[PDB]
Every structure is written in structure tokens, then in C-alpha cells.
């Protein structure tokens, strides 16, 4: 379903009980949760694993190469998608 112009979301100034993405305000799942790859902080730090993979792609950077420095512009922290 994608005909609407709004959807349910969560916003707070501490660790949310139902945290949501910074790209599509979805709430963590059982296959694609949420996590903060960066130090943007607040309610726009979280992101789905998919959403991050599409974000760093829009930034015009090859995350599969050792010739990159894939990171933010809000807080400028190096983005993290593995540990
Ligand atoms: Zn998302
Ligand atoms: Zn950031």
C-alpha cells in the first residue's frame, strides 16, 4: 500500500521503545530491525539495513571498495553497516 501521504512514526529525546527509521519512519522488524550507523543523534539516527544500503548508494560511493570514506553530512561520522 503506497497511495497515502502519511503513516505511523515515533519521535523522542532518549532510547525509544518503538524506534523508527530516518528515511521511511518504519519501526524495527524481525528480519530488518533498526540501528544507528552514525552520531546524527535524536530520532534521525536510526535506519533499516536496507534503507542504509540505499542511502550510501544515493551518496555516489562504492561501499564494496577500499578507496572510499563512506560517511554522513549532518554529523559527518563514518557510517557503519558491519561489526
Ligand atoms: Zn527505512
Ligand atoms: Zn551522521
Curated annotation (Swiss-Prot):
Zinc fingers, RING-CH-type class: 13-82
Binding site for Zn(2+) 1: 21, 24, 48, 51
Location relative to the cell: Endoplasmic reticulum membrane; Nucleus inner membrane
Residue ranges annotated as Cytoplasmic topological domain: 1-83
Residues annotated as binding Zn(2+) 2: 38, 40, 72, 75
Domain writeup: The RING-CH-type zinc finger domain is required for E3 ligase activity.
Protein role: E3 ubiquitin-protein ligase which accepts ubiquitin specifically from endoplasmic reticulum-associated UBC6 and UBC7 E2 ligases, and transfers it to substrates promoting their degradation. Mediates the degradation of a broad range of substrates, including endoplasmic reticulum membrane proteins (ERQC), soluble nuclear proteins and soluble cytoplasmic proteins (CytoQC). Component of the DOA10 ubiquitin ligase complex, which is part of the ERAD-C pathway responsible for the rapid degradation of membrane proteins with misfolded cytoplasmic domains.
Subunit structure: Component of the DOA10 ubiquitin ligase complex which contains E3 ligase SSM4/DOA10 and CDC48-binding protein UBX2/SEL1. The DOA10 complex interacts with the heterotrimeric CDC48-NPL4-UFD1 ATPase complex which is recruited by UBX2/SEL1 via its interaction with CDC48. Interacts with its associated ubiquitin conjugating enzymes UBC6 and UBC7 with its membrane anchor CUE1. Interacts with PEX29.
Similarity remark: Belongs to the DOA10/MARCH6 family.
Protein name: ERAD-associated E3 ubiquitin-protein ligase DOA10
Highest classification ranks of the organism: Eukaryota, Fungi, Dikarya, Ascomycota, Saccharomycotina
Record gene name: SSM4
